[PDB]
Amino acid sequence: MAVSTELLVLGVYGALAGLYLLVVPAIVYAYLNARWYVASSFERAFMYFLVTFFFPGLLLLAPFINFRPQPRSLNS
Amino acid sequence: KFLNQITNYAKEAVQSAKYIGQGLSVTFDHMRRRPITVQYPYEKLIPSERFRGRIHFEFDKCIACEVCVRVCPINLPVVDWVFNKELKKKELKHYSIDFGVCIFCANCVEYCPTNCLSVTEEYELATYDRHELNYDSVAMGRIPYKVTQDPMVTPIREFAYLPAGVMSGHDLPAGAQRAGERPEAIANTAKSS
Amino acid sequence: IDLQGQFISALQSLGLSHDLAKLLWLPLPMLMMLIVATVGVLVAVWLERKISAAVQQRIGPEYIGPLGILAPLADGLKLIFKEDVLPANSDRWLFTLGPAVVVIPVFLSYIIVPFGQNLLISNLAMGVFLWIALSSIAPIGLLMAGYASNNKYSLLGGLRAAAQSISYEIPLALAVLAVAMMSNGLGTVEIVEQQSQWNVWRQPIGFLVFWIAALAECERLPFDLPEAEEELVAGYQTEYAGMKFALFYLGAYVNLVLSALLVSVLYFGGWSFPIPLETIANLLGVSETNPFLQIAFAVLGITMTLIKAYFFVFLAILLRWTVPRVRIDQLLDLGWKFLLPVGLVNLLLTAGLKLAFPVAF
Amino acid sequence: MLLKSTTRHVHIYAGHVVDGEVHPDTETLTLNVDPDNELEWNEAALAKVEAKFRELVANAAGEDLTEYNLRRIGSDLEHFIRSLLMQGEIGYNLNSRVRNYSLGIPRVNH
Amino acid sequence: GLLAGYQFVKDLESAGALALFVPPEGGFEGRYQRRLRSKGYTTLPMSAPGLGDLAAYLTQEHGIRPAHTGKEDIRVYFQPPLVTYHLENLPPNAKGLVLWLIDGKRLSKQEFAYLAQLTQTLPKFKVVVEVGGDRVVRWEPLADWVA
Amino acid sequence: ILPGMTVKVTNPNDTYYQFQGIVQRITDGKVAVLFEGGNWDKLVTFQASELEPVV
Numbered sequence: 055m056a057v058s059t060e061l062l063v064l065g066v067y068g069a070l071a072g073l074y075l076l077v078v079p080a081i082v083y084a085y086l087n088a089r090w091y092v093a094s095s096f097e098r099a100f101m102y103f104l105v106t107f108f109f110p111g112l113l114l115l116a117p118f119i120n121f122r123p124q125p126r127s128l129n130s
Numbered sequence: 131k132f133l134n135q136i137t138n139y140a141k142e143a144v145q146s147a148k149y150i151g152q153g154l155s156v157t158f159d160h161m162r163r164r165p166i167t168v169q170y171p172y173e174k175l176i177p178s179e180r181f182r183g184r185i186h187f188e189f190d191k192c193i194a195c196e197v198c199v200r201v202c203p204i205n206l207p208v209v210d211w212v213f214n215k216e217l218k219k220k221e222l223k224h225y226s227i228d229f230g231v232c233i234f235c236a237n238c239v240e241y242c243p244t245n246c247l248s249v250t251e252e253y254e255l256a257t258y259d260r261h262e263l264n265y266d267s268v269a270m271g272r273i274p275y276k277v278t279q280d281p282m283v284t285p286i287r288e289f290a291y292l293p294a295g296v297m298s299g300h301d302l303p304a305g306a307q308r309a310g311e312r313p314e315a316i317a318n319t320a321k322s323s
Numbered sequence: 324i325d326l327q328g329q330f331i332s333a334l335q336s337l338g339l340s341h342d343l344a345k346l347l348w349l350p351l352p353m354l355m356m357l358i359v360a361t362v363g364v365l366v367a368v369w370l371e372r373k374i375s376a377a378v379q380q381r382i383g384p385e386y387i388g389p390l391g392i393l394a395p396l397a398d399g400l401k402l403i404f405k406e407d408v409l410p411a412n413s414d415r416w417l418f419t420l421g422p423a424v425v426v427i428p429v430f431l432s433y434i435i436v437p438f439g440q441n442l443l444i445s446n447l448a449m450g451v452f453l454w455i456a457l458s459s460i461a462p463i464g465l466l467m468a469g470y471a472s473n474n475k476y477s478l479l480g481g482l483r484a485a486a487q488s489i490s491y492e493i494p495l496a497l498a499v500l501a502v503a504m505m506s507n508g509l510g511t512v513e514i515v516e517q518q519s520q521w522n523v524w525r526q527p528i529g530f531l532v533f534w535i536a537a538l539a540e541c542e543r544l545p546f547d548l549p550e551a552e553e554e555l556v557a558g559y560q561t562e563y564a565g566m567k568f569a570l571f572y573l574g575a576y577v578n579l580v581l582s583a584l585l586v587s588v589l590y591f592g593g594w595s596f597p598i599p600l601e602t603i604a605n606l607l608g609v610s611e612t613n614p615f616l617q618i619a620f621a622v623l624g625i626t627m628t629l630i631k632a633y634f635f636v637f638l639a640i641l642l643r644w645t646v647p648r649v650r651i652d653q654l655l656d657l658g659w660k661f662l663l664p665v666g667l668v669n670l671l672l673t674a675g676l677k678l679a680f681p682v683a684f
Numbered sequence: 685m686l687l688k689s690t691t692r693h694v695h696i697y698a699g700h701v702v703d704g705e706v707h708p709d710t711e712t713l714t715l716n717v718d719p720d721n722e723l724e725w726n727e728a729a730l731a732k733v734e735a736k737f738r739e740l741v742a743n744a745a746g747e748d749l750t751e752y753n754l755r756r757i758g759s760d761l762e763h764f765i766r767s768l769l770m771q772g773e774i775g776y777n778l779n780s781r782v783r784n785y786s787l788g789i790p791r792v793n794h
Numbered sequence: 795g796l797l798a799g800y801q802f803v804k805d806l807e808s809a810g811a812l813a814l815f816v817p818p819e820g821g822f823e824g825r826y827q828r829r830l831r832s833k834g835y836t837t838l839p840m841s842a843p844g845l846g847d848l849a850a851y852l853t854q855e856h857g858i859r860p861a862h863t864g865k866e867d868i869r870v871y872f873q874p875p876l877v878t879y880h881l882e883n884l885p886p887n888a889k890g891l892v893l894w895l896i897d898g899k900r901l902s903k904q905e906f907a908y909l910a911q912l913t914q915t916l917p918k919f920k921v922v923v924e925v926g927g928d929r930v931v932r933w934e935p936l937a938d939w940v941a
Numbered sequence: 942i943l944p945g946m947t948v949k950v951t952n953p954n955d956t957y958y959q960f961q962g963i964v965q966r967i968t969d970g971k972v973a974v975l976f977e978g979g980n981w982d983k984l985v986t987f988q989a990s991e992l993e994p995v996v
């Protein structure tokens with residue numbers, strides 16, 4: 055019966071840590087890789103704010119990502 | 131005497147503030163436009179139709195008249211002929227060009243009488259050892275690069291091969307032509323009325 | 324929650340001399356602030372290189388990490404492994420000390436950066452005044468980097484650097500003075516808790532003076548005189564190679580995140596999602612000991628601090644590529660001829676408005 | 685101020701290296717054959733180079749100390765070094781460094 | 795997978811001639827050359843576009859003709875075989891000599907087959923040819939990739 | 942498609958569209974066409990499919 059709030063707060067900020075440095079940074083990579091050459095000025099500012107806020111999380115899984123252009127069908 | 135100086139000071143300060151606000155707005159606007167960067171390693175810029183790249187040499191067409199050696203600004207192309215004695219025919223033994231000394235002016239390609247010498251679109255020459263830039267008669271043909279036939283490069287036309295009114299060549303359809311009609315098309319239209 | 328309470332209690336549960344537990348906790352915030360300062364430096368370098376590229380229809384670093392995220396890491400690790408040079412007749416001990424005296428007091432001023440209440444290292448009684456006093460040691464560092472060089476190129480740069488850092492210290496103090504008039508005090512938490520329903524709307528001139536003075540701390544291309552490449556090669560930095568140069572490269576961006584956070588807390592407030600949040604009694608939350616509401620409002624306060632710090636970091640590294648440079652004499656006329664008179668005028672105006680209308684001041 | 689003739693694998697100065705500095709002197713003419721180790725040296729070859737340097741600085745010098753004459757001495761020293769390398773007294777370093785044959789490629793003496 | 799063991803060296807010793815597919819930014823294959831060099835193998839890269847028959851340059855001799863520029867009438871040099879001369883100048887405890895070719899894309903299928911066949915004979919001699927391509931540093935035996 | 946023949950280019954996605962040249966060399970399935978025009982004879986390599994042996 056570990057329904058104690060002393061454990062539930064540990065659970066909630068242990069989930070918050072993962073959301074901050076494991077989950078939302080990947081969504082930021084995805085979103086900011088999708089809308090980069092088409093974003094407006096304010097959207098660019100918001101994207102850079104998003105990188106600023108989650109930088110500690112973006113650093114951790116940065117080495118595990120390739121943004122290379124995915125070789126194309128040449129004959130076509 | 132003293133009020134004119136102050137009104138000039140105010141008319142200068144407010145002007146300097148407006149002319150900074152305008153530049154700030156212009157710069158904050160600039161970051162909405164698509165970057166013109168031609169991201170070279172994966173977005174190589176396809177060269178023109180007259181681009182003077184590495185020289186190409188067809189050993190079979192050379193007659194060893196040495197005009198390439200004579201119109202060269204620095205007499206660069208080494209031609210080693212022996213003049214066989216069948217009736218009069220010169221024989222070619224070794225043709226070479228030190229591309230480390232080369233100037234890429236293509237005077238040699240302009241005055242080759244036998245179309246034995248040509249220019250290519252290989253601008254990607256680079257070595258760790260300059261002594262490897264001296265091209266044999268065989269290392270010169272080698273069937274040039276053709277940036278377009280590369281599975282990891284999205285070719286990008288330059289300003290002279292983009293349709294009318296188009297300035298950048300990044301977001302381009304798959305059916306663009308250079309600027310206008312070719313001469314054969316204009317003559318064909320003139321042929322029918 | 325009061326993580327300090329839990330830490331000291333759980334550490335005293337197994338003995339360990341309760342008074343000693345309070346000594347075993349200081350490293351925790353003293354390195355949490357170091358962590359956030361280093362991440363802020365990495366963010367500032369990345370933002371500069373990626374925003375200057377967007378402004379110029381370009382692309383910043385993209386082949387280091389996914390988005391050039393690893394670009395500051397690479398630029399730092401390189402400077403770590405670089406051979407350090409010490410020229411022929413230069414001094415040996417003031418050389419390796421300039422870049423450290425220009426850095427230590429820039430880090431030490433992070434004692435007073437709140438990031439929400441009870442979320443700062445030891446809200447001090449001197450607070451912003453301690454920062455005004457500590458920001459006066461860097462000129463000693465620049466004079467030290469210039470005096471310990473056999474290069475007359477760089478002594479002239481150290482002098483014109485130490486003469487600019489003292490020109491923008493009187494207006495930078497006269498703006499904080501007008502803020503402390505309203506704030507009833509000097510501690511940053513006590514300065515910000517006067518925003519209970521923002522000082523920018525009542526100090527519209529002191530804000531301008533503070534911001535200009537902070538940008539003119541040998542920081543931004545509006546001025547950046549000792550870094551103005553064209554007129555002179557790097558000024559005093561022209562002889563530092565490895566980590567000694569990275570200390571300059573680093574002590575100039577931390578001195579920018581610091582100023583952004585300080586403008587935030589002085590004129591805007593590291594709290595207060597704009598509505599008077601703590602009047603969220605409409606959800607019947609017992610904040611007092613609510614185990615969560617506490618963490619929710621903590622996250623809201625951190626986000627609201629970082630939004631307004633990023634606003635000013637963005638605006639500074641945007642003005643870097645918008646405002647043309649001034650020689651050195653059009654610079655020393657901002658202070659002492661425009662910023663000092665306007666600072667005094669703002670102080671007298673705040674005094675007159677506080678004596679006449681003691682409400683709202 | 686210094687007066688020097690600095691090229692690849694020859695560095696003539698006009699001072700005395702006391703511990704790593706240079707200290708212009710107006711009569712020392714220091715020499716620093718092959719600092720970057722393009723070649724591999726022997727005890728006899730370095731002695732030959734020093735002897736050539738001495739007979740080049742001493743036996744033929746009554747002229748000014750302009751940088752022109754310093755270059756003129758360095759050029760002769762480097763021609764001597766190239767001759768040593770041609771005869772085979774020394775050779776390229778072959779180490780994992782840049783390895784660009786600045787004095788010529790290896791040939792077979794036909 | 796962001797960090798590599800020594801499978802590259804084992805695969806090179808097995809096949810003899812590999813064909814890299816490095817990404818077109820050129821900073822992620824040097825570590826594989828360093829792995830090769832740490833085992834005992836010595837490398838020498840020579841930028842394939844610029845070699846001759848590949849049999850006169852690697853196995854036999856060949857007369858290099860430098861750039862006379864109006865002066866110094868045509869002279870030949872006859873530089874020694876770029877392989878048989880470097881197999882003699884190996885360090886004392888050397889496991890072999892692998893040949894690195896940077897721009898392998900310029901060569902032809904005939905020259906690739908020749909370089910593959912040359913590995914079986916001439917024992918202490920392996921070959922790596924950076925044929926351009928994939929966005930990860932993958933390899934494949936050079937006997938394959940052709941025909 | 943053999944060397945020496947005069948060919949034209951039929952590929953709308955190429956900068957050398959509807960150009961005419963002469964085949965200089967063919968290896969490994971790809972050809973090399975020389976366009977004699979302008980001033981300097983150009984030589985570029987096409988696939989065997991992006992040509993047409995004009996009469």
Ligand SMILES: CCCCCCCCCCCCCCCCCC(=O)OC[C@H](CO[C@@H]1O[C@H](CO[C@H]2O[C@H](CO)[C@H](O)[C@H](O)[C@H]2O)[C@H](O)[C@H](O)[C@H]1O)OC(=O)CCCCCCCCCCCCCCCCC
Pocket residue numbers: 067070071072073074075078107108109110111324325326358359361362363439440441442594595600601610616617618620621622624625
């Ligand atoms: C490079 C830059 C970035 C690098 C990241 C930094 C490295 C650290 C990585 C670890 C991240 C995991 C931590 C999870 C965050 C949740 C913890 C939290 O919020 O804890 C908050 C508590 C709250 O403290 C208590 O807070 C109480 C109430 O909140 C108060 O807080 C303020 C003071 O008044 C407000 O005004 C508010 O109204 C007020 O009530 C009382 O003040 C108590 O006195 C006080 O002890 O403090 C605490 O332990 C917090 C102490 C740890 C600090 C770490 C915070 C990191 C920021 C994460 C933000 C996430 C944002 C959303 C994530 C998901 C994406 C959407």
Ligand SMILES: CCCCCCCCCCCCCCCCCC(=O)OC[C@H](CO[C@@H]1O[C@H](CO[C@H]2O[C@H](CO)[C@H](O)[C@H](O)[C@H]2O)[C@H](O)[C@H](O)[C@H]1O)OC(=O)CCCCCCCCCCCCCCCCC
Pocket residue numbers: 106107109110324325326327328350351352354355356359362363366438440441442443444445446580625632
């Ligand atoms: C035997 C060998 C031993 C050797 C020891 C060495 C080993 C080291 C041990 C492990 C290393 C861990 C390092 C970090 C752990 C985290 C500790 C922590 O969580 O420490 C918590 C600390 C402490 O403050 C908190 O303070 C409150 C308590 O009040 C008291 O707390 C303070 C201390 O008293 C103040 O004095 C306050 O006024 C006082 O009243 C809270 O409720 C907690 O109790 C208390 O811990 O948090 C704070 O200090 C606030 C500072 C953090 C704020 C975070 C904002 C985060 C920034 C956003 C992140 C993204 C940034 C990227 C972009 C940046 C761009 C600008």
Ligand SMILES: CCCCCCCCCCCCCCCC(=O)OC[C@H](CO[C@@H]1O[C@H](CS(=O)(=O)O)[C@@H](O)[C@H](O)[C@H]1O)OC(=O)CCCCCCCCCCCCCCC
Pocket residue numbers: 116117118119120357358361387388393396795796797817822929930931
């Ligand atoms: C106040 C406190 C502050 C203290 C300061 C903190 C200091 C931190 C120092 C550490 C920083 C290191 C960051 C490294 C990031 C990075 O490598 O870039 C990512 C790049 C990107 O390319 C990658 O490469 C892959 C392609 S490929 O196969 O390499 O070609 C592919 O994944 C894609 O290209 C890309 O993902 O990876 C590489 O290119 C190859 C480099 C290999 C890196 C080595 C792995 C890390 C090991 C650490 C050592 C552990 C030892 C034990 C291991 C057994």
Ligand code: SF4
Pocket residue numbers: 191192193194195196197198199209241242243244246247
């Ligand atoms: S290619 Fe032309 S110029 Fe050169 S030798 Fe042959 S015929 Fe003469």
Ligand code: SF4
Pocket residue numbers: 185198201202203204205206207227231232233234235236237238239
């Ligand atoms: S490109 Fe210039 S230098 Fe080279 S062979 Fe032709 S004319 Fe001579």
